[PDB]
Amino acid sequence: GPHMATGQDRVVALVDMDCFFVQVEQRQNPHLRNKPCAVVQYKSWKGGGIIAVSYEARAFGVTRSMWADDAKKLCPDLLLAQVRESRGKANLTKYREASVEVMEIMSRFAVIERASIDEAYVDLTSAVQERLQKLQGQPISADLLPSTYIEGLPQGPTVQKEGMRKQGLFQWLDSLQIDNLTSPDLQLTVGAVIVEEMRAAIERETGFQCSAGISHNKVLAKLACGLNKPNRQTLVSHGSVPQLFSQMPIRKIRSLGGKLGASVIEILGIEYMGELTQFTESQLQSHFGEKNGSWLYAMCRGIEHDPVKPRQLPKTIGCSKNFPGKTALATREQVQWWLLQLAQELEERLTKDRNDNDRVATQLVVSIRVQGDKRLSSLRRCCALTRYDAHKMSHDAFTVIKNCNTSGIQTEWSPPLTMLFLCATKFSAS
DNA sequence: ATTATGACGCT
DNA sequence: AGCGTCATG
Ligand SMILES: [Mn+2]
Ligand SMILES: [Mn+2]
Ligand SMILES: [Mn+2]
């Protein structure tokens, strides 16, 4: 009753750029705007691998992970932009720099947690309190929410998309008790007003469109963000969770799309998140562990406590390249040359990071895959990172991995290497 | 032969 | 520390 906590204390948003790398290329090249287009890495093998797809191209069935030659079978007029190549490898600097543009705008509204190159969580609880005390009981006008969907509405007793959006928003705003400065539904609504302002600022100042979710925690905000893309935002209220989850496949919730979610489905004999409510917390902990079990028990009721961490910058800076098949590295000269290429890119990114962010990495992690190993990383080893020098970094990486060469001769490398990875970690204030 | 990352949990 | 899982631009 009055003591069963409901996880409605916070207002959390998730802002995610629409087809981010495509928008970066469309800003640069106006000929790609409002076109089916995709961004690719490399070109020789099957036209390159697609990593981002405009919504026009998605309508034709084009997806990430598709080879461009196959995409062109679905969409013959598909336009392609290629990721820059530097030192023999894909270079994603343009998109990291665009990401920083967006993150700096978001940070003007609230402290953010960078979750990926194109998305960030926002804790809006305090900004919402401020805007509410500024409003002093004045209701919220639909005009302040021009791109907002209210999940679950309209309901109860026009055949256009925008018309339904407005119908749902009108039902929501009529139901609102705008006199209660502590009503969670009102708090979410003001949160959505702020997120409209943040998304307007991002588009005005960068040209980039985004979507967003507003709810009481990170998982619901992420899920909400996906419900109405592109260029829209969605409010998922605490009350909307039972209906939403009653037909939600377990795999759609962040962290359940892999082996654990498959085991929830198989062990419990269920398919939808709502079905988790029938198990006790101890039952779920017995199957899935203390932490997972408690998390599932609360999450299926809409409750999750993971904080929005104050972290705008990545914790690690890394450089990786695969060498599939005939391109696998089979000589020590090859291995050394590619370690040097990766280390030169790493040095350049690290030096810029130290100037921009007043910090230095102190640990170098070297990861490799040997041909014939199914695991994505065959071996991972750390060493000290004491100088931002690519030649020293690559020599140290070689020292750390040279024991893996099973070749009797030192000129050859066996089994050949199918991936190299250098990662700088353990940052300290400079 | 989706590839280039990056966060985080486990032991 | 090194390995596994999850996400996916
Ligand atoms: Mn996105
Ligand atoms: Mn994203
Ligand atoms: Mn995506």
XYZ file of C-alpha atoms (C1' of nucleotides) and ligand atoms in Angstrom:
453
model
C 0.000 0.000 0.000
C 1.433 3.346 1.136
C 4.888 1.758 1.611
C 5.274 -0.159 -1.679
C 7.724 2.145 -3.456
C 6.787 2.812 -7.067
C 10.049 4.054 -8.609
C 8.574 7.396 -9.674
C 11.059 9.677 -7.907
C 13.112 10.677 -10.967
C 12.530 12.082 -14.435
C 14.995 10.486 -16.904
C 15.273 11.076 -20.638
C 17.227 9.230 -23.332
C 18.111 11.329 -26.430
C 19.233 9.338 -29.515
C 20.303 10.878 -32.812
C 18.371 9.543 -35.808
C 20.579 7.480 -38.266
C 23.450 9.421 -36.799
C 26.348 8.763 -39.200
C 23.962 9.279 -42.153
C 22.905 12.681 -40.786
C 26.562 13.661 -40.363
C 27.202 12.824 -44.028
C 23.961 14.540 -45.172
C 24.904 17.760 -43.377
C 28.260 17.728 -45.168
C 26.831 16.774 -48.586
C 23.392 18.293 -49.335
C 22.963 15.964 -52.338
C 22.363 13.131 -49.844
C 19.567 14.881 -47.935
C 16.055 13.366 -47.999
C 17.351 10.386 -49.967
C 17.703 6.664 -49.357
C 21.275 6.581 -48.214
C 23.589 4.574 -46.045
C 27.086 4.815 -44.582
C 29.581 2.037 -45.358
C 32.991 0.902 -44.130
C 35.429 -0.128 -46.909
C 34.316 -1.001 -50.454
C 36.191 -3.895 -52.068
C 34.397 -6.830 -50.419
C 30.695 -6.834 -51.415
C 30.612 -3.028 -51.713
C 31.446 -2.393 -48.055
C 29.536 -3.073 -44.856
C 26.633 -0.787 -43.983
C 26.668 0.676 -40.470
C 23.926 3.354 -40.687
C 20.778 3.719 -42.821
C 18.469 6.657 -43.559
C 14.775 6.096 -42.856
C 14.022 6.426 -46.585
C 16.404 3.509 -47.211
C 14.973 1.502 -44.294
C 11.629 1.554 -46.107
C 13.285 -0.635 -48.799
C 14.588 -3.140 -46.241
C 18.135 -1.794 -45.999
C 19.678 -2.468 -42.603
C 22.905 -2.200 -40.651
C 25.175 -5.296 -41.098
C 24.116 -5.589 -44.761
C 26.717 -5.571 -47.511
C 26.188 -2.610 -49.834
C 25.929 -4.862 -52.923
C 22.978 -6.667 -51.313
C 21.404 -3.402 -50.178
C 21.576 -2.204 -53.796
C 19.558 -5.242 -54.783
C 16.796 -4.019 -52.438
C 17.212 -0.315 -53.284
C 18.957 0.285 -56.621
C 18.974 4.075 -56.107
C 20.578 3.821 -52.650
C 23.206 6.501 -52.107
C 26.336 5.588 -50.142
C 28.841 7.585 -48.130
C 32.084 5.916 -47.096
C 33.824 6.254 -43.731
C 37.233 7.894 -43.999
C 40.248 5.621 -44.247
C 43.500 6.649 -42.489
C 46.632 4.488 -41.983
C 44.864 1.572 -43.754
C 41.870 1.452 -41.455
C 38.471 2.999 -40.929
C 38.696 6.348 -39.127
C 35.605 7.479 -37.233
C 36.892 10.920 -36.120
C 34.240 12.910 -38.039
C 31.448 11.176 -36.125
C 33.142 11.426 -32.734
C 33.549 15.179 -33.276
C 29.874 15.510 -34.298
C 28.919 13.570 -31.168
C 30.837 16.048 -28.997
C 28.844 18.865 -30.680
C 25.567 17.317 -29.600
C 26.704 16.291 -26.107
C 27.887 19.842 -25.374
C 24.448 21.236 -26.250
C 22.664 18.642 -24.116
C 24.937 19.444 -21.174
C 23.545 23.013 -21.096
C 20.212 21.620 -19.925
C 21.357 19.011 -17.400
C 24.143 16.653 -16.446
C 24.274 13.820 -18.981
C 25.579 10.244 -19.189
C 27.093 9.464 -22.623
C 25.763 5.956 -23.382
C 27.069 5.725 -26.981
C 28.462 7.916 -29.799
C 24.899 9.091 -30.530
C 22.953 8.879 -27.291
C 22.862 10.215 -23.796
C 20.727 9.920 -20.701
C 19.552 13.074 -18.914
C 18.453 13.321 -15.281
C 15.783 16.012 -15.479
C 14.432 15.724 -11.920
C 15.913 19.040 -10.738
C 15.222 20.956 -13.961
C 11.619 19.728 -13.702
C 11.268 21.019 -10.141
C 12.613 24.377 -11.331
C 10.268 24.648 -14.313
C 7.270 23.635 -12.163
C 7.975 26.313 -9.581
C 8.359 28.757 -12.482
C 4.959 27.753 -13.887
C 3.200 28.170 -10.502
C 0.214 25.950 -11.277
C -0.238 27.023 -14.838
C -1.356 24.042 -16.966
C 0.740 22.722 -19.834
C -0.419 23.604 -23.333
C -0.326 21.067 -26.154
C 1.607 23.759 -28.054
C 4.592 23.082 -25.787
C 4.645 19.397 -26.847
C 4.542 19.530 -30.666
C 6.411 16.272 -31.317
C 5.444 14.254 -28.202
C 3.579 10.936 -28.155
C 1.948 9.649 -24.974
C 2.373 5.876 -24.994
C -0.936 4.050 -24.543
C -3.115 6.937 -25.685
C -5.563 7.608 -27.138
C -7.726 4.895 -25.598
C -11.369 4.176 -24.875
C -14.481 5.728 -26.498
C -9.464 10.599 -37.859
C -7.197 8.138 -39.681
C -4.005 10.226 -39.759
C -0.784 9.750 -37.798
C -0.444 13.317 -36.485
C -4.151 13.318 -35.659
C -3.804 10.295 -33.393
C -0.716 11.835 -31.796
C -2.729 14.943 -30.933
C -5.721 12.889 -29.726
C -3.509 11.011 -27.291
C -1.785 14.157 -26.086
C -5.156 15.809 -25.503
C -6.427 12.874 -23.419
C -3.183 12.979 -21.432
C -3.274 16.714 -20.745
C -6.949 16.597 -19.720
C -6.164 13.868 -17.225
C -3.421 15.996 -15.618
C -3.540 17.302 -12.039
C -1.349 20.360 -12.647
C -2.020 21.523 -9.080
C 0.147 18.785 -7.510
C 3.814 19.787 -7.752
C 4.706 16.199 -6.762
C 2.455 14.315 -9.216
C 4.777 11.962 -11.164
C 2.668 12.285 -14.338
C 2.967 16.077 -14.191
C 6.699 15.772 -13.581
C 7.098 13.577 -16.665
C 5.064 16.074 -18.709
C 7.281 18.995 -17.719
C 10.256 16.744 -18.458
C 8.896 16.274 -21.967
C 8.535 20.060 -22.364
C 12.227 20.433 -21.487
C 13.185 17.635 -23.897
C 11.296 19.364 -26.724
C 13.433 22.429 -25.972
C 16.660 20.373 -25.907
C 15.828 18.668 -29.204
C 14.978 22.029 -30.787
C 18.339 23.382 -29.609
C 20.223 20.373 -31.007
C 18.541 20.712 -34.401
C 18.938 24.513 -34.555
C 22.621 24.436 -33.594
C 23.804 21.328 -35.462
C 21.256 20.494 -38.139
C 20.793 17.038 -36.622
C 17.435 15.540 -35.697
C 16.923 13.170 -32.810
C 14.294 11.200 -30.998
C 13.844 10.857 -27.269
C 12.137 8.959 -24.503
C 10.943 10.429 -21.196
C 10.143 8.163 -18.252
C 11.108 7.496 -14.648
C 14.300 5.519 -15.293
C 16.896 4.690 -17.934
C 15.395 1.416 -19.221
C 11.934 2.892 -19.735
C 13.410 6.045 -21.288
C 15.434 3.985 -23.787
C 12.410 1.845 -24.629
C 10.218 4.934 -25.010
C 12.746 6.565 -27.323
C 12.393 3.665 -29.753
C 8.588 3.741 -29.935
C 8.232 6.692 -32.323
C 11.261 7.303 -34.509
C 12.379 9.402 -36.322
C 12.277 12.984 -35.068
C 9.723 12.414 -32.302
C 9.709 11.899 -28.542
C 7.626 9.543 -26.412
C 6.478 9.777 -22.795
C 6.133 6.395 -21.019
C 4.288 6.903 -17.743
C 4.362 4.547 -14.784
C 0.701 3.762 -15.467
C 1.394 2.774 -19.087
C 3.727 -0.060 -18.065
C 1.229 -2.956 -17.497
C -0.303 -2.663 -20.967
C 3.022 -1.891 -22.664
C 4.747 -4.870 -21.059
C 1.839 -7.281 -21.538
C 2.853 -7.812 -25.186
C 6.565 -6.725 -24.942
C 8.969 -9.506 -25.972
C 11.565 -9.900 -23.222
C 14.403 -9.310 -25.715
C 13.355 -5.695 -26.326
C 14.488 -4.499 -22.885
C 18.083 -3.322 -22.689
C 20.375 -6.142 -21.381
C 17.858 -8.899 -22.167
C 18.516 -9.197 -25.893
C 21.115 -11.957 -25.529
C 21.812 -15.163 -23.608
C 20.184 -14.062 -20.331
C 16.917 -13.082 -21.990
C 16.888 -16.366 -23.875
C 17.278 -18.182 -20.560
C 14.466 -16.167 -18.947
C 12.221 -17.257 -21.821
C 13.289 -20.896 -21.752
C 13.492 -21.471 -17.979
C 10.263 -19.689 -17.116
C 8.296 -20.672 -20.222
C 7.177 -17.087 -20.901
C 7.474 -14.631 -23.797
C 6.536 -11.112 -22.585
C 7.931 -8.872 -19.863
C 4.558 -8.563 -18.171
C 4.580 -12.307 -17.474
C 7.524 -11.837 -15.095
C 5.255 -10.304 -12.465
C 3.937 -13.738 -11.435
C 7.264 -14.893 -9.965
C 8.566 -13.990 -6.543
C 11.787 -12.075 -6.136
C 13.352 -15.191 -4.595
C 12.217 -17.311 -7.552
C 13.841 -14.953 -10.033
C 17.015 -14.740 -7.923
C 17.150 -18.532 -7.802
C 17.178 -18.777 -11.574
C 19.166 -15.674 -12.554
C 21.275 -14.677 -9.542
C 20.748 -12.182 -6.733
C 21.388 -9.065 -8.793
C 19.619 -10.077 -11.999
C 16.695 -11.524 -10.055
C 16.108 -8.350 -8.022
C 16.524 -6.282 -11.187
C 13.967 -8.368 -13.115
C 11.500 -8.339 -10.197
C 11.499 -4.556 -10.143
C 11.911 -3.955 -13.879
C 8.820 -5.891 -14.896
C 6.837 -3.497 -12.634
C 8.432 -0.471 -14.336
C 10.997 0.186 -11.595
C 14.758 0.473 -11.991
C 17.254 2.461 -9.958
C 20.422 2.680 -12.118
C 21.601 6.305 -11.849
C 22.337 8.655 -14.704
C 26.101 8.895 -14.205
C 27.744 12.290 -14.620
C 30.030 11.204 -17.462
C 30.114 13.022 -20.818
C 33.415 11.544 -22.041
C 34.279 7.934 -22.945
C 36.224 5.990 -20.303
C 38.449 4.302 -22.885
C 39.926 5.238 -26.251
C 40.623 2.285 -28.548
C 41.591 1.346 -32.124
C 40.712 -2.032 -33.681
C 41.002 -3.750 -37.065
C 39.952 -7.192 -38.322
C 42.081 -9.121 -40.828
C 39.742 -11.795 -42.197
C 40.816 -14.760 -44.275
C 43.569 -14.141 -46.793
C 44.362 -10.796 -45.126
C 45.284 -12.409 -41.773
C 48.710 -11.266 -40.608
C 51.237 -14.054 -41.168
C 54.643 -12.348 -40.841
C 56.148 -10.468 -37.920
C 56.807 -7.506 -40.231
C 53.075 -7.441 -41.033
C 52.112 -7.639 -37.361
C 54.533 -4.845 -36.502
C 53.350 -2.621 -39.353
C 49.701 -2.871 -38.344
C 50.439 -2.453 -34.631
C 52.210 0.747 -35.644
C 49.255 1.950 -37.747
C 46.835 1.374 -34.865
C 49.263 2.985 -32.413
C 49.643 6.098 -34.581
C 45.870 6.558 -34.678
C 45.715 5.958 -30.910
C 48.482 8.508 -30.290
C 46.659 11.112 -32.353
C 43.362 10.563 -30.524
C 45.046 10.436 -27.100
C 46.971 13.659 -27.667
C 43.797 15.481 -28.727
C 41.999 14.005 -25.696
C 44.706 15.235 -23.309
C 44.499 18.767 -24.717
C 40.688 18.848 -24.701
C 39.871 17.090 -21.448
C 42.877 17.525 -19.099
C 43.506 13.830 -18.496
C 46.001 11.092 -19.391
C 45.564 7.359 -19.861
C 47.874 5.126 -17.833
C 47.125 1.571 -19.080
C 47.420 0.050 -22.560
C 45.328 -3.049 -23.315
C 46.382 -5.189 -26.293
C 43.871 -7.690 -27.660
C 44.249 -10.126 -30.527
C 42.369 -12.909 -32.244
C 44.199 -15.867 -33.776
C 42.783 -17.583 -36.843
C 40.577 -20.509 -35.858
C 39.304 -19.048 -32.565
C 35.564 -18.441 -32.396
C 35.790 -15.971 -29.504
C 36.055 -12.387 -30.707
C 39.114 -11.865 -28.476
C 41.661 -14.658 -28.315
C 43.921 -12.907 -25.822
C 43.910 -9.690 -23.800
C 46.956 -8.330 -21.981
C 47.697 -5.019 -20.275
C 50.929 -3.065 -19.934
C 51.910 0.376 -18.672
C 51.147 3.396 -20.855
C 53.666 6.010 -19.730
C 54.203 8.070 -22.910
C 51.953 9.101 -25.788
C 54.369 7.742 -28.389
C 53.073 5.423 -31.114
C 56.449 3.765 -31.629
C 56.773 2.877 -27.938
C 53.133 1.812 -27.712
C 53.447 -0.526 -30.711
C 56.745 -1.976 -29.482
C 55.170 -2.623 -26.057
C 52.106 -4.243 -27.640
C 54.410 -6.472 -29.677
C 56.398 -7.404 -26.577
C 53.183 -8.289 -24.794
C 51.794 -10.499 -27.585
C 54.952 -12.013 -29.101
C 54.632 -15.080 -26.852
C 51.551 -16.146 -28.862
C 53.482 -16.880 -32.062
C 53.648 -20.694 -32.138
C 55.835 -20.562 -35.253
C 59.274 -22.020 -34.650
C 60.734 -19.374 -36.939
C 60.425 -15.752 -35.818
C 59.972 -14.366 -39.342
C 56.567 -16.018 -39.718
C 53.523 -15.693 -37.476
C 51.372 -18.728 -36.769
C 48.525 -19.058 -36.347
C 47.937 -15.863 -38.360
C 46.270 -12.953 -36.577
C 42.733 -12.002 -37.581
C 42.294 -8.955 -35.352
C 44.398 -6.358 -33.525
C 43.060 -4.019 -30.834
C 44.824 -1.296 -28.833
C 42.920 0.415 -26.030
C 43.984 3.202 -23.672
C 42.325 3.016 -20.239
C 42.630 4.152 -16.590
C 42.569 7.925 -17.067
C 43.905 10.346 -14.438
C 43.541 14.116 -14.241
C 46.523 15.685 -16.002
C 33.912 -11.971 -44.419
C 28.685 -7.160 -40.757
C 33.402 -4.099 -38.725
C 34.892 -0.559 -35.168
C 34.188 0.315 -30.877
C 32.767 0.913 -25.773
C 30.420 -0.198 -21.116
C 30.198 -3.393 -17.508
C 29.745 -7.941 -14.801
C 32.219 -12.053 -13.146
C 35.850 -14.407 -10.726
C 43.893 -8.918 -14.059
C 41.803 -11.392 -17.958
C 37.464 -13.195 -19.793
C 32.542 -12.959 -21.161
C 28.186 -10.388 -22.343
C 25.603 -6.866 -24.443
C 25.000 -3.098 -27.503
C 25.144 -1.441 -32.368
C 27.159 3.637 -35.570
Mn 20.671 6.729 -33.166
Mn 22.056 5.110 -30.318
Mn 20.581 1.719 -34.294
